Amino acid sequence: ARAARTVLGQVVLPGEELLLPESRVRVVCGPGLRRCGDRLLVTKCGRLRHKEPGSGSGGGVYWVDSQQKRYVPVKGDHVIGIVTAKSGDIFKVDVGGSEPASLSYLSFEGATKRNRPNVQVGDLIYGQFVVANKDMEPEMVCIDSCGRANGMGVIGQDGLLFKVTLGLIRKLLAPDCEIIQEVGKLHPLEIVFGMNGRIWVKAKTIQQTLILANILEACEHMTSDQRKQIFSRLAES
Amino acid sequence: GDHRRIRGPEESQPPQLYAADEEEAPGTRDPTRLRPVYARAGLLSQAKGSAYLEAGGTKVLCAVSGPRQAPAALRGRLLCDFRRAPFAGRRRRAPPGGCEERELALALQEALEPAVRLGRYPRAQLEVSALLLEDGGSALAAALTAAALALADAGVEMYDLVVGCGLSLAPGPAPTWLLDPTRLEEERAAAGLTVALMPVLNQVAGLLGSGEGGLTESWAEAVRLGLEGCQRLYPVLQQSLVRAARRRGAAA
Amino acid sequence: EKESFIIEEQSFLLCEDLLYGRMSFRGFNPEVEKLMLQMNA
Amino acid sequence: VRYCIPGERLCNLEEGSPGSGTYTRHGYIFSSLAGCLMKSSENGALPVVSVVRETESQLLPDVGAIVTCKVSSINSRFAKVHILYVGSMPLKNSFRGTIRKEDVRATEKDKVEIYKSFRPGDIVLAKVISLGDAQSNYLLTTAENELGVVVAHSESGIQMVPISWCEMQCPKTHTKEFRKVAR
Amino acid sequence: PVQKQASLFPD
Amino acid sequence: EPLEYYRRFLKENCRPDGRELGEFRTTTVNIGSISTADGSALVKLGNTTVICGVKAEFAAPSTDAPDKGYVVPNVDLPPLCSSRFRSGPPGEEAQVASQFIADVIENSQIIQKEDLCISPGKLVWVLYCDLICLDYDGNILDACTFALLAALKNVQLPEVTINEETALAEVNLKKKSYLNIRTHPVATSFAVFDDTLLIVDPTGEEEHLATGTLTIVMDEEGKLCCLHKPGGSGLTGAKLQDCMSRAVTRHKEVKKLMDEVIKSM
Amino acid sequence: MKETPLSNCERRFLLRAIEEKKRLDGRQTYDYRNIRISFGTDYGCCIVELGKTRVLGQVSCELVSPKLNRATEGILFFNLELSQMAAPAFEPGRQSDLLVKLNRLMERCLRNSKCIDTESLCVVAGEKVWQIRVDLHLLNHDGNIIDAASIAAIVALCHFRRPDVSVQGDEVTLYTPEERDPVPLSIHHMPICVSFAFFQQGTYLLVDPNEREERVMDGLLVIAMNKHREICTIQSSGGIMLLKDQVLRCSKIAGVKVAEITELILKALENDQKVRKEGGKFGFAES
Amino acid sequence: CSLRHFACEQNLLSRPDGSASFLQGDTSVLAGVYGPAEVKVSKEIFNKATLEVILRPKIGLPGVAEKSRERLIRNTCEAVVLGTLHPRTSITVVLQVVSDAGSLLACCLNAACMALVDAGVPMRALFCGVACALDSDGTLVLDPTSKQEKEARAVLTFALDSVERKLLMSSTKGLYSDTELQQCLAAAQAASQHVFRFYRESLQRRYS
Numbered sequence A: 001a002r003a004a005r006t007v008l009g010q011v012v013l014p015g016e017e018l019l020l021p022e023s024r025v026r027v028v029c030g031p032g033l034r035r036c037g038d039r040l041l042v043t044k045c046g047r048l049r050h051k052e053p054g055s056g057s058g059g060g061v062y063w064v065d066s067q068q069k070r071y072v073p074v075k076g077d078h079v080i081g082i083v084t085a086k087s088g089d090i091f092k093v094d095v096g097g098s099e100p101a102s103l104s105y106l107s108f109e110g111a112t113k114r115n116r117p118n119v120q121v122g123d124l125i126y127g128q129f130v131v132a133n134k135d136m137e138p139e140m141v142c143i144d145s146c147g148r149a150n151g152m153g154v155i156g157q158d159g160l161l162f163k164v165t166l167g168l169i170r171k172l173l174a175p176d177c178e179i180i181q182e183v184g185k186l187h188p189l190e191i192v193f194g195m196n197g198r199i200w201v202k203a204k205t206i207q208q209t210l211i212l213a214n215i216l217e218a219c220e221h222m223t224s225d226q227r228k229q230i231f232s233r234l235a236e237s
Numbered sequence B: 001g002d003h004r005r006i007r008g009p010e011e012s013q014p015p016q017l018y019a020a021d022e023e024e025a026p027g028t029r030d031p032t033r034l035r036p037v038y039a040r041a042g043l044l045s046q047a048k049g050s051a052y053l054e055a056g057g058t059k060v061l062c063a064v065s066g067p068r069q070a071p072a073a074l075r076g077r078l079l080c081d082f083r084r085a086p087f088a089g090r091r092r093r094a095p096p097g098g099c100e101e102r103e104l105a106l107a108l109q110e111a112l113e114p115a116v117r118l119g120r121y122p123r124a125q126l127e128v129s130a131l132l133l134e135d136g137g138s139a140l141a142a143a144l145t146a147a148a149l150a151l152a153d154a155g156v157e158m159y160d161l162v163v164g165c166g167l168s169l170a171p172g173p174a175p176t177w178l179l180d181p182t183r184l185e186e187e188r189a190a191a192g193l194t195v196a197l198m199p200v201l202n203q204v205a206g207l208l209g210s211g212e213g214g215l216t217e218s219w220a221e222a223v224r225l226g227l228e229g230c231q232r233l234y235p236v237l238q239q240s241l242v243r244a245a246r247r248r249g250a251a252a
Numbered sequence C: 001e002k003e004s005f006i007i008e009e010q011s012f013l014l015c016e017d018l019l020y021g022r023m024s025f026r027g028f029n030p031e032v033e034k035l036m037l038q039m040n041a
Numbered sequence D: 001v002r003y004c005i006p007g008e009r010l011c012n013l014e015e016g017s018p019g020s021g022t023y024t025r026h027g028y029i030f031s032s033l034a035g036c037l038m039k040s041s042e043n044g045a046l047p048v049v050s051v052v053r054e055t056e057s058q059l060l061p062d063v064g065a066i067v068t069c070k071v072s073s074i075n076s077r078f079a080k081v082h083i084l085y086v087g088s089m090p091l092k093n094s095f096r097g098t099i100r101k102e103d104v105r106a107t108e109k110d111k112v113e114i115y116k117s118f119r120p121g122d123i124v125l126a127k128v129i130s131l132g133d134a135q136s137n138y139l140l141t142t143a144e145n146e147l148g149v150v151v152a153h154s155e156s157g158i159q160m161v162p163i164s165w166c167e168m169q170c171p172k173t174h175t176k177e178f179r180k181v182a183r
Numbered sequence E: 001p002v003q004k005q006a007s008l009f010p011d
Numbered sequence F: 001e002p003l004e005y006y007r008r009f010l011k012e013n014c015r016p017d018g019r020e021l022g023e024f025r026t027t028t029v030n031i032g033s034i035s036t037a038d039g040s041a042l043v044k045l046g047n048t049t050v051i052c053g054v055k056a057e058f059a060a061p062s063t064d065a066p067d068k069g070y071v072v073p074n075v076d077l078p079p080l081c082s083s084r085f086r087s088g089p090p091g092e093e094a095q096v097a098s099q100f101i102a103d104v105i106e107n108s109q110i111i112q113k114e115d116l117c118i119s120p121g122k123l124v125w126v127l128y129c130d131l132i133c134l135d136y137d138g139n140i141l142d143a144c145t146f147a148l149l150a151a152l153k154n155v156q157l158p159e160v161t162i163n164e165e166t167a168l169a170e171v172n173l174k175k176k177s178y179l180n181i182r183t184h185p186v187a188t189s190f191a192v193f194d195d196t197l198l199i200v201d202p203t204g205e206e207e208h209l210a211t212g213t214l215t216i217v218m219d220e221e222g223k224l225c226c227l228h229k230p231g232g233s234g235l236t237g238a239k240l241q242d243c244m245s246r247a248v249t250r251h252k253e254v255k256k257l258m259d260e261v262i263k264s265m
Numbered sequence G: 001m002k003e004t005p006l007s008n009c010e011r012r013f014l015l016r017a018i019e020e021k022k023r024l025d026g027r028q029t030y031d032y033r034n035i036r037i038s039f040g041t042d043y044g045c046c047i048v049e050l051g052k053t054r055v056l057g058q059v060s061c062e063l064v065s066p067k068l069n070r071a072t073e074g075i076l077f078f079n080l081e082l083s084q085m086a087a088p089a090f091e092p093g094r095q096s097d098l099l100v101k102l103n104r105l106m107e108r109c110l111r112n113s114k115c116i117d118t119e120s121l122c123v124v125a126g127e128k129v130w131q132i133r134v135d136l137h138l139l140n141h142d143g144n145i146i147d148a149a150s151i152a153a154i155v156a157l158c159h160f161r162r163p164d165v166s167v168q169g170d171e172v173t174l175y176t177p178e179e180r181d182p183v184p185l186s187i188h189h190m191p192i193c194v195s196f197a198f199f200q201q202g203t204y205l206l207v208d209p210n211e212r213e214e215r216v217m218d219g220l221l222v223i224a225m226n227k228h229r230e231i232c233t234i235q236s237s238g239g240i241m242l243l244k245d246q247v248l249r250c251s252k253i254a255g256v257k258v259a260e261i262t263e264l265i266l267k268a269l270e271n272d273q274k275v276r277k278e279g280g281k282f283g284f285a286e287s
Numbered sequence H: 001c002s003l004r005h006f007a008c009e010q011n012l013l014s015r016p017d018g019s020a021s022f023l024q025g026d027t028s029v030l031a032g033v034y035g036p037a038e039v040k041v042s043k044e045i046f047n048k049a050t051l052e053v054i055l056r057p058k059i060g061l062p063g064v065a066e067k068s069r070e071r072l073i074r075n076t077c078e079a080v081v082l083g084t085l086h087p088r089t090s091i092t093v094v095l096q097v098v099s100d101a102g103s104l105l106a107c108c109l110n111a112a113c114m115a116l117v118d119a120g121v122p123m124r125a126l127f128c129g130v131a132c133a134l135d136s137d138g139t140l141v142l143d144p145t146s147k148q149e150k151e152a153r154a155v156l157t158f159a160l161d162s163v164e165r166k167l168l169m170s171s172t173k174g175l176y177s178d179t180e181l182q183q184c185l186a187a188a189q190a191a192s193q194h195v196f197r198f199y200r201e202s203l204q205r206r207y208s
Helices: A166-172 A177-185 A209-218 A225-236 B101-112 B140-154 B183-186 B216-251 C030-039 F001-013 F092-105 F139-156 F203-206 F238-263 G006-021 G094-112 G146-157 G211-215 G246-275 H065-080 H107-119 H146-151 H178-206
Strands: A027-029 A033-036 A041-042 A048-052 A061-064 A080-088 A092-096 A126-130 A139-141 A161-165 A189-194 A200-202 B038-043 B049-053 B060-067 B077-081 B125-134 B161-169 B177-179 B192-198 B208-211 C006-008 C023-025 D022-025 D028-031 D036-041 D048-051 D065-075 D079-086 D098-099 D124-132 D138-141 D148-151 D159-166 D167-169 F025-033 F039-044 F048-061 F070-076 F124-137 F156-163 F168-178 F188-193 F198-200 F210-221 F225-230 G037-040 G045-050 G053-064 G078-083 G123-124 G128-138 G165-168 G171-176 G192-197 G206-209 G219-225 G233-237 G282-286 H005-010 H019-023 H027-037 H050-056 H091-099 H127-134 H140-142 H156-162 H167-174
Touching: A027 A033, A033 A061, A033 C006, A048 H005, A080 A189, A080 A200, A161 A209, A161 G006, A166 A189, A177 A225, A177 G206, A189 A209, A200 A209, A209 A225, A209 H065, B038 B216, B049 B140, B060 B140, B060 G233, B077 B101, B101 B125, B101 B140, B125 B140, B140 B161, B140 B192, B140 B216, B161 B183, B177 B216, B177 H140, B192 B216, C023 C030, D036 F188, D065 D138, D079 D124, D098 D124, D098 F210, F001 F203, F025 F139, F025 F238, F039 F139, F048 F139, F070 F092, F070 G171, F092 F139, F092 F225, F092 H065, F092 H167, F124 F139, F139 F188, F139 F210, F139 F238, F188 F238, F198 F238, F225 G192, F225 H167, F225 H178, G006 G206, G006 G211, G037 G146, G037 G246, G045 G146, G045 H091, G053 G146, G078 G094, G094 G146, G123 G165, G128 G146, G146 G192, G192 G246, G206 G246, G219 G246, G246 G282, H005 H107, H005 H178, H019 H091, H019 H107, H027 H107, H050 H065, H065 H091, H065 H107, H065 H127, H065 H156, H065 H167, H091 H107, H107 H127, H107 H178, H127 H167, H127 H178, H140 H178, H156 H178
Parallel strands: A027 C006, B077 B125, D098 D138, F070 F124, G078 G128, H050 H091
Antiparallel strands: A033 A041, A048 A061, A080 A092, A080 A126, A126 A139, A161 A200, A189 A200, A189 C023, B038 B049, B049 B060, B060 B125, B161 B177, B161 B192, B192 B208, D022 D028, D036 D048, D065 D079, D065 D124, D079 D098, D124 D138, D124 D148, D159 D167, F025 F039, F039 F048, F048 F124, F156 F168, F188 F198, F188 F210, F210 F225, G037 G045, G037 G282, G045 G053, G053 G128, G123 G128, G165 G171, G192 G206, G192 G219, G219 G233, H005 H019, H019 H027, H027 H091, H127 H140, H127 H156, H156 H167
């Protein structure tokens, strides 16, 4: 109940109310926050964090960098999925949430009744949500709004799909990551990060793929010893 | 050991079996007699229909949880749960049962399905729940009558009411058919019988019996006697239902 | 003439900037390489 | 006035006809319920006898009705509801209705969107059309500007006011939710 | 048969 | 729109039935209604109803306490009480209430188990107290406890003896003996709405749409046997002392009732 | 709830890595995962965790009237529970096949092999005897249970101690752990299972399979062994066609594996006793 | 201190969403949470998440007392946990009693809270559980031991909240009086303060 500015780098715990200064300037409540009157209730333990837009009118933005495993269908998030079945026109794909999301046979890039896509049960997908809400089952799509799949659609095959923590992704996709840069020097690869803690990787051989997946699922707290160890191993593959 | 009830003793036998006496025998009475009956419909509130019947030491409830979604295939159903309270009878039995409760449930269902008309209640199951608070003689008959009252009260359709009556056999040298007996006349008995009918159209709906002995003619006389008893009993139930309907009219 | 002063969001994008998921390093699927060049600016 | 019983006869076929809550046997009618009987008379002079348990006598939401309901479940296709007030007389026998996608606004545009018209846990009022056959699924419609949502609770616990046709706001704080506001 | 009074559910 | 409809009455310091937020409904009992049982008691609070039958049997004790006559309660909420129950085994509410009754029996110490040993190490009584709900309009724990106590006062047991020649025990179903009970635990219920609004003897709906519930058992000599507080919006001692006072009052009332009854026999 | 389905990608990748003799974490085929044996404060509790699969084991005693057929020797009561924390699918009363097969297998292995002395634990021949029950609980489910369940039951039944008893004629006197020192059990030999998993109808075989390897396997060969090379049980499940040489080789493997596990168990018990003989209510062993 | 050395540990188990081992003295409970997940149309309820608790000891089978206790925990969590955010889904809290040395609920509640935290589940306020034992002489003891519970005439488990230190739950064994209840409740509030300080320390060191 004090000094939102003094705890922008501290560990907040649920229950805590924090209030912000002022006639006023619009702001936004992050994911791990909640609004109680004119105050901000915290709903999840986290190292609080703030940001401001390059302008001076936007006000600001607040959130908590909470680590966890379970995913919740959110809107405008790129997400991997696993087709669980098909009902007539629409086929239901799993995401890792409360319930399975839905696609449409004509959402993929360039499809109509006389041109259906090749999606088989068990096939994995990289889409994004357009209706993600607590009251309605989430529908996803594998096509930008303009009408082109800018990297979406079926993933492919000949790769390894594993699962990690969500904060790990939220960190790796950062433009100032060291591990995912250093890996671009030892051996090539191509990988999909899904904001649901689910990752897909491919390389030429398989030993490399396995070493890479182990690194990624461990890179949250790897020691320099193990770091250069696995780097040397990759260099010797 | 049951893990849904309180930890009691493994076994527990009653004290009577450890008694030492020749229990009292009833003796004589008017064979064509009936006990005083108190039947009232509308007792319970949270139930669409309920009924209560007392005849001597007999004390029975019945409730009807009404239609609950669950031609000859889209025909209604009614499932009946008979259940004697563990504090009825000389001996105690755990609530579950599994020997005679289910037999008497089958009896109730076989005696109610005819009266009730289920074509007008398709895709539905009526949960009938009987409860025997005290056993003092003819029990299954009281249960039939109470379930009939509860149904007629909840407003389920029918063709006629169900009236039951229990008979026993005197083990004397001149065995006579004893009408509407007591638990003593029933434990000191040779044969027992139970009729249940629909008196307007004069049709049996479900009967039952058993015997240390008997013979065709005796069983037939028993049957007709129980029929006459049920006839003589019908008006009580009639008046009870009328009374409950008047009370409802009064409430609004 | 009123407007909301605080709004509830649940997206880590407005919250925080992030690169494009599907990427590649020195050769695998150059299409993803041009996607990287495109969407990461 | 007389209360009847599921076995007693009431009249010959030559002195009446079964309307409801009865049945027929050889040359006679016989009740089927514990309740009050009534023999209505048409201009034809032949009476129609019937029996009723006036506790919940009878109700019938006809086509051109105006019935309230509560939005429980929704989908991109339809939104299901429960019937509470048929007009103004409640009915403890809560019937279950449905609202289709296109049958939501008089303009009939396909641009309509449930999540921006309805939400689970709010009261609306609509006009029934089809009774239904198997599950008696009432299908309700709101193709009118004085129809739809009337009361709607906020993000968490506040009741909002219908500002405009597709906007609603809570009075305490400020936040513009989207519905098919009525009137 | 005559009636009686409720030893258990009087009214 | 039930909750809203209910707050309207609540703020008028009343309820939709005619109770002044702090008073109960018509409480009645009936003792000895049943012969097949040793003890019998019917209780009903207006629409709510309960019936206890207590049977008496013999059994062999444990090895940790030979001089302990068991008292086994079991609650039954059959489907005829309310539609929220289904034919089958016992649910959750029945089991919780059973454990509550047992905790009471064990803590209030209304009865001395030692007063049930005939021949220690060999025999001891077992009192099977079977309670049955018949209308769950609300506040079933109070009714259960009160009916239990009533029947457990009604119960009078026979006298038994041991014969060394036969090495067996005999009963005398002619002579008997009542059952001494020291404490008279009465239970008082409460429903706590959003923050500060405590209603007493809540019926069904009032418990359905409530933020929390509370129950408090108050022995005669200004003591407590149980404070059953399963979840809720919270409370401070100030919203609790008042409940304790009201519980004392209810104790007085129901004890007067039970005395009048056992004396009208 | 339900377990998330398995993608064809992962399935094919696993099958290929098997073809090429490559496990996932980085171990070979003839290797277990680091198994840790940790003890509790109460004699009879053991938490054994192999990799991610944690299993708890408690051992309790009672005195009861024996069964007429065997009035001399006592009783033993196994039970394994699959706690919902082990995995979502483990709702109560739903995954009954797995419970049944595991419990029968464990009963068979330990009981019928005569691992403990049901005779030593007699007190009054005909009236009162002991009753040793063992409750295993599955906490995390990552792969191999039977091995974990068995190691736990064994560590417990070797790390348990009875309340001493004195007897004269029929006069039996029990005493408390504070009045005398509880007496341990009587084991003859400690068996612990070993699990092999078959891939591609029998061509490939792995040890200590993870959860995915259990989802893309067709067959499971359990083999119980001792440090003395004594088959106690062997079972084939999954509807698979194996041969003779396969079981022979798997047995020659289980030999070494059980020898090593046994050495570890003994070391763990030694360390726990040493600790308690120095102040400390724990004991820890690492593969 | 007035109460005994007590520690915790987070993210033990890989398969469940969030996990927490909470031990105090020699009692040790282990909690595992399955966050918003599927739920059949029978168990669910709109505008709320179904919270289901299942507690199982390490001996015998679960009977009735454990069912009562898990109802208590269920309703406490429903009191703090936000569920109008995640309707038509199920949160599940599994509790296992590794050890039993009295003060059991006071440990199960703390573990449940820590697990819910680790699972990043939206809570309105932390909660805690303490246990106070009144011997015959009235001398109370906080966080008792089984000896102290047997040698005592009353025991009182209080589940408190963090925002306003109210009383979310109370489960009592034995028979006691009013003033004793009040004073033991105050002592419970102090103990809860200490427990909350501990939670903050643990999470500070977890996010470091």
